[PDB]
């Protein structure tokens, strides 16, 4: 009851209500999380109800995907920090897009553990 690896999840890619979903909240909340030493280059936050991402490991909000993934069946509100600059250190730069959109993720004994972040790179 708390696996670790969910957890971090959370910590990674969780915010519930964030504010202004600016390039400056970027650089706070990746800051916030610890993922700045090195910079990562490119990570993404869900926002809303905790319930609805944990839903996507069953069918109630989840369709399976590719080789070993869940896709959700409800969109959900997003913001993608892109590292900006050519630096893995920090000062870490970040630029903010937000969107709206299902997501996929990888799913342990009932609960999201990994998010697939190829679906949000813009290349």
């Not at 999380?33 to 926002?47: E, W």
Request: glycine share 6%; hydrophobic share 25%.
């Amino acid at each position: 009851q708390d696996n670790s690896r969910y957890t971090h999840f959370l910590t990674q890619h969780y915010d519930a209500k964030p504010q202004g979903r600016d390039d400056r909240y970027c650089e706070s909340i990746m800051r916030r999380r610890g993922l700045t030493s090195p910079c990562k280059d490119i990570n993404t936050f869900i926002h809303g109800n905790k319930r609805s991402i944990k839903a996507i490991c069953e069918n109630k909000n989840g369709n399976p995907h590719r080789e070993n993934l869940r896709i959700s069946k409800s969109s959900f509100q997003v913001t993608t920090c892109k590292l900006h600059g050519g630096s893995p250190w920090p000062p870490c730069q970040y630029r903010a897009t937000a969107g709206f959109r299902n997501v996929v993720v990888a799913c342990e004994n009932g609960l999201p553990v990994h998010l697939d972040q190829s679906i949000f790179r813009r290349p």
